[PDB]
Amino acid sequence: LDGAKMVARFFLQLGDYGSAIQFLVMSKCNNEAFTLAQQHNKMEIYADIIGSEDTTNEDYQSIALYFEGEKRYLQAGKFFLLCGQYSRALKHFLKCPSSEDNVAIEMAIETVGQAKDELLTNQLIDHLLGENDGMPKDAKYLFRLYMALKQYREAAQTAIIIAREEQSAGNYRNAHDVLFSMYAELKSQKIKIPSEMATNLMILHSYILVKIHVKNGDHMKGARMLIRVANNISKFPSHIVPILTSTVIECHRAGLKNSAFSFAAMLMRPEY
């Protein structure tokens, strides 16, 4: 222990507080570490160093009680979460002011997700559904809470809502990226993929592949993707005539002249 304190004293003379703090585990002087890490605001580095066998939840709790005394409710919340005090951690995340509300809600979602407590869950759902403050929050947070709770089918329904909105707006890449992040998770787990989610994502990715194939000069793959997109044209309400016109042109370029004629006869309707 005492040879290690000399090595600490040498790094204190060089001014490397990061190396000096390890000797407060290695020479067991842990309270001089707590106060030194406090004085330089390196408390996360002390809490990570505290991953050794010498240590306790009372270390993470003494750290949490320090940040609670500083009224640093987000950091107090983080060290109560590491101590396993989920109710205090959530109550501190919910007491955060509106300048940290996104990160506090993400950590409240993580706190409720780790806790699995129905009272805390309903308390946070009542907060996301605004029954405590007079405002709902973005559907991305209800989606992220359902994912944190592993309520994956309810998360999938919420992802379809977020995607259908983005399809209506013409944001086919965003609708795609949302459904994809959910489809990949549902596929990584052993869980039912919604037939609508699979159908929609497939249709959206087919539209993205038109750009890739037409750029690469593969008029056949471009036209065949355009034919599928055109057989589902109601899912693209912002780009109907551009897609159908491109479908005719790429079908004609591909030698799919009956398909080109069928989408030309469709484009010849008074609506288009």
Binding site: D2, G3, K5, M6
Partner: protein, 123 residues
């Protein structure tokens, strides 16, 4: 029963050199209370050590004296040593403090010195 050695001519808080040359397991319960050197022999030293009792005292199932249940050992030990740069610490003697003696007062060869009980001088 260990001997440590440590160094600090230059500033230090050192690890010990350790030697296991002391075989006497009888000393484990004793604590030194008085000590002396010979006024003529710089290599010669002595210490008196008491057998200290624990903080609160038990009793036996039978009405025996409470730790005097068994056969004799020293109330207080007198240990004498030869000390040298070439051979370290050598136990010259170990003995019980005499039953007529209340403490070690000194040493100068040929004698250890002790304080006698006035309970016994008049007999």
């Amino acid at each position: 029963g260990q001997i440590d050695r440590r160094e600090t001519l230059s500033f230090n808080e050192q690890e010990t050199n350790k030697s296991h040359l002391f075989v006497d397991e009888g000393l484990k319960n004793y604590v030194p209370v008085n000590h002396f050197w010979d006024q003529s022999e710089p290599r010669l030293f002595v210490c008196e050590a008491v057998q200290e009792t624990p903080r609160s005292q038990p009793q036996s199932a039978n009405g025996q004296p409470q730790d005097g249940r068994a056969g004799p050992a020293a109330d207080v030990l007198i240990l004498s040593f030869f000390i040298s740069e070439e051979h370290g610490f050598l136990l010259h003697e170990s003995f019980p403090r005499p039953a007529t003696s209340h403490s070690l007062l000194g040493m100068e060869v040929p004698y250890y010195y002790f304080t006698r009980k006035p309970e016994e001088a008049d007999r």
